[PDB]
Design a protein around this ligand. Structure first.
Ligand code: NAD
Lengths: 337, 75, 319, 319
């Protein structure tokens, strides 16, 4: 049993905690420590009453000022912004889950390793050559001495299994993407001062575009496509779920039905539990809480000229990404060294 | 169908009569069976159009398209 | 310009899915449909009085249809009469206009020789008598009219003049599609799986043949094997040079039932001179309408192949 | 380097024209011939005393042939004994030297498993019993020895142990050529036209198959038609993926008689992966020897195709 911790009890942290509360019996992981910038009275309320996933129902949530009782299970909790003053060796922490969006560097994330933690899994595309791993693509090829691992962004975590399937079946020369992304917490609500100008504007009002390198992270997790994948993101006023457009330029020519057939059988042989395949005419809010990290929308797949394919993929960047974080954490627990 | 429903059976009676009586292999009752097959063909054309009977949408959007149930701003 | 397409068959005018596949290919904006039962001379009353079928070269005004057909080339809006089908009578005519593509289809689209000199591309569509019976059983079974098994005796009574009146037109058509009972499958009803063959004619330029791996040497190919896991019974193609009615033809022939996708793209990757601007375009044109009758067998393959050659002839005629 | 080629068949050692076609291909400068009746244990006197044929795994010193075969790789001149064929006895050996290409041919070139691990490329050569009878009739007819029609009873007496001793070697050979009576022609004697087929095996690299128009989908092609005027009866090829003895094979099959030149170049232009550096090289290798038996049918086609694959394996082994 592996004692794990959570740095930053935000959206990813609350979803990680809720996922572990829903996957408790099959777990080699026991969540024993969290730390947020809030007191332990508030974040227990925010855990129980999520305005996106409704009221939690299965287990009882309560807290006092030093611990949080989730379903009778106790969990410790502290508050500090310095990662160096944190009781890790005092709590016996193998794996800490970096989810603050602050400690993306190696030198930032390694502060927990210095302060007495054994491995760190950071839920962000980290700066510098941090080894990145996506469940369903290359979650096998990590060396267990790599204590500082990184899951990529949610967009990369959705996009990379589709790109893996299409690269194996057809071969990819180039590829664009344009993810229509739900608004995240970084954007200011009204027009307030912010480091980047396109995130400074109002979130509920605007399609704000942004440039991301998270398309290039597929070139990290798939090495032979690096420098060939690039794309932008569009933040639109939907709170939870998002869709990603993906334009690839394959070289083995095909039609629109065949790529759907390929991804449909890949959903049932290898990418089971990663890619779901849906031939329904659903819309965005029917994917709040879906377990797969990419639902391929079947009716919109199209091929022009044989060698130019477009797919779109629904994905929940708050629930499915947390599911892949927890699956990667359990998969590194199963190969603990 | 009631009119051609009767007329097909009437031409079937004639097919039993004229091609047993006035020559089983000649142009007359071959014209009779050709007629009955055309009556059958128009029964088929009636049948396929009643298979394609719309329920509501190609009625309510046939007469009143701009209602909120079938505005399509295919844009 | 005015182009013209002749279709021949007794599948009912506007009552066959080949016109539906042409509609999916061209569009009813670019083409218009002309039935040819409209040019009947007189009615079913006068058919009973004259003792004559709807197949007589007396029974149509073949000259006024020619005058409207020639006036179609000159751009003017034609005024064609209409056979009132329920009564057997004749409507006062309708003024319809020409289009980019004009089709002609009926029992005698090709019996006239001046219009045979006029038609830019011709298709006869043949049916064997067995699947005639298998389609009439479905005709009087789905309707439950209870008129079966003397229609068997209507078949051979409709037969003899039909072979005199209609079947010598196929000696002048370009492409003729025969549909046979399947030699491959035996333990079914006699109309499930079709053994279809599109006897296409050489000679007249613009029309290429579609040859399977070689022009002019008979080749019977079964695509089952290392890359396709065939179901029962799978496909069994054919090909062969031939001389039908003393004319240089090239039969391309398919027996079987298309059960899935990869066995229908793998066949299409190996046909040649199919005149596509698009890879797998024939498979897309198969699967834009999964509900059409005969999409699962070679009939829907051959009909869209002929329509794709009609695209080729249209591009030849319009540069 | 030392390369090695295994040939298996009861056509008499050095008594089949496939070795002659290999001689026309490589040259007796580059290759040497090794019969395998030379490694017999004891004589026809001891065959009569022990009551045993020349097909017994007792009847050969399988270890000393292996020692000379392994010493062939090391470059030294081997010292091989010789079966005195007229007496049945054994010559004191001859010191022969290795060459660029070494062949091995006999009744058991492949029965040993260490030499099966040694042989670089293997060929079994099968014969159906009908053309066995048709060749023995020519054997005792041209010689006029008058020993016929009880050799028919020698056939089935030679049969049963032969299927035990020899025929399980073909489960380990690469290429096996079966020769059958022709289904195509009926009103001849039973050995004129052959129905031959070269079951070749996938797997082991360097050896490609030779596929007719498609890898792995059965295709029966007749090259008669618009460009070839076929005589009687003409050719009828075949092809097919198959699994023989649970092994991934690809039968390429020819029935007919090559009567002229253009029908033999037109076939050769359409085979694929035949590994020629030269256009029509297979046709030239057919017609460098018009007098060889079996040049007019597919046996001479398949033998030189196998020898051309032996060129391919030799170029793979010598870079
Ligand atoms: N928002 C999404 O749906 C999503 C999807 C994939 C990945 N991510 C990544 O997850 C990370 C966090 O996302 P989020 O929505 O939970 O962020 P958030 O800002 O909503 O929540 C982060 C929490 O961490 C706390 N925190 C910040 N710095 C801290 C520090 N130094 N010490 C302690 N607590 C600290 C914040 O106050 C807040 O409580 C970011 O890297 C984000 O890019 C987000």
């Amino acid at each position: 049993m592996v004692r794990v911790a959570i740095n930053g009890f935000g959206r990813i942290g609350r979803n990680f905690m809720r996922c572990w509360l829903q996957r408790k019996a099959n777990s080699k992981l026991e969540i024993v420590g969290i730390n947020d910038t809030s007191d332990p009275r508030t974040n227990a309320h925010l855990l129980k009453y999520d305005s996106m996933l409704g009221i939690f129902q299965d287990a009882e949530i309560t807290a006092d000022d030093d611990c949080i009782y989730a379903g009778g299970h106790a969990v410790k909790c502290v508050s500090d912004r310095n990662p160096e003053n944190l009781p890790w060796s005092a709590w016996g922490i193998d794996l800490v889950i970096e989810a603050t969006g602050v400690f993306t560097s190696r030198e930032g994330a390694s502060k927990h390793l210095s302060a007495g933690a054994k491995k760190v899994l950071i839920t962000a595309p980290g700066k510098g050559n941090i080894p990145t791993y996506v469940v369903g693509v290359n979650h096998h090829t990590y060396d267990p001495s790599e204590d500082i691992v990184s899951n990529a962004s949610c967009t990369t975590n959705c996009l990379a299994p589709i790109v893996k399937v299409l690269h194996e079946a057809f071969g990819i020369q180039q590829g664009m993407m344009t993810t229509t992304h739900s608004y995240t917490g970084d954007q200011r609500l009204l027009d307030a001062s912010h480091r980047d100008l396109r995130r400074a504007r109002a979130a509920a009002m605007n399609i704000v575009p942004t440039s991301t390198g998270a398309a290039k992270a597929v070139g990290l997790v798939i090495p032979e496509l690096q420098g060939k994948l690039n794309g932008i993101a569009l933040r639109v006023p939907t709170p939870n779920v998002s869709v990603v457009d993906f334009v690839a330029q394959v070289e083995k020519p095909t039609i629109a039905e065949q790529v759907n057939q390929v991804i449909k059988e890949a959903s049932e042989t290898t990418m089971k539990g990663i890619i779901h395949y849906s031939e329904l005419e659903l819309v965005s809010s029917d994917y709040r809480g879906h377990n797969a990290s990419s639902i391929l929308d079947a009716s919109l797949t199209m091929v022009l000229g044989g060698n130019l394919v477009k797919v779109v993929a629904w994905y929940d960047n708050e629930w499915g990404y947390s599911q892949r974080v927890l699956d990667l954490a359990e998969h590194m627990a199963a190969h603990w060294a | 169908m009631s009119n051609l429903e009767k007329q097909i059976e009437q031409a079937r009676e004639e097919a039993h009569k004229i091609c047993d009586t006035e020559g089983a292999t000649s142009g007359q009752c071959a014209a009779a069976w050709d007629a009955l097959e055309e009556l059958q063909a128009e029964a088929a054309h009636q049948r396929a159009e009643q298979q394609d009977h719309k329920t509501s949408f190609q009625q309510y959007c046939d007469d009143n398209p701009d209602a909120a149930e079938c505005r399509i701003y295919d844009d | 310009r005015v182009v013209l397409i002749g279709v021949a068959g007794d599948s009912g005018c506007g009552k066959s899915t080949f016109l539906r596949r042409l509609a999916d290919l061209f569009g009813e904006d670019f083409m218009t449909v002309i039935c040819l039962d409209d040019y009947h001379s007189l009615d079913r009353k006068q058919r009973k009085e004259m003792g004559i079928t709807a197949l007589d070269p007396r029974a149509n005004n073949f000259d006024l249809m020619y005058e409207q057909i020639k006036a179609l080339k000159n751009g003017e809006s034609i005024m064609k009469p209409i056979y009132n089908h329920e009564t057997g009578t004749i409507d006062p005519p309708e003024k319809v206009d020409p289009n980019h593509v004009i089709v002609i289809e009926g029992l005698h689209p090709l019996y006239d020789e001046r219009v045979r000199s006029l038609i830019d591309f011709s298709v006869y569509l043949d049916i064997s008598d067995d699947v005639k019976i298998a389609w009439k059983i479905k005709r009087d079974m789905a309707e439950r009219g209870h008129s079966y098994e003397d229609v068997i005796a209507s078949i051979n009574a409709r037969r003899p003049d039909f072979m005199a009146y209609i079947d010598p037109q196929k000696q002048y058509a370009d492409v003729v599609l025969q549909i046979l009972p399947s030699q491959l499958a035996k333990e079914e009803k006699v109309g499930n799986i079709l053994r279809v063959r599109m006897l296409q004619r050489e000679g007249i330029p613009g029309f290429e043949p579609v040859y399977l791996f070689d022009e002019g040497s008979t080749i019977t190919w079964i695509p089952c094997g290392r890359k396709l896991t065939c179901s029962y019974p799978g496909i069994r193609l054919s090909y062969g040079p031939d001389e039908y009615y003393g004319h240089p033809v090239s039969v391309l022939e398919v027996d079987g039932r298309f059960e899935k996708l990869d066995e229908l793209i793998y066949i299409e990757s190996h046909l040649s001179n199919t005149s596509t601007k698009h890879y797998g375009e024939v498979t897309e044109l198969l699967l834009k309408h999964r509900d059409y009758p005969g999409s699962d067998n070679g009939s829907g393959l051959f009909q869209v192949l002929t329509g794709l050659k009609m695209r080729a002839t249209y591009e030849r005629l319009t540069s």
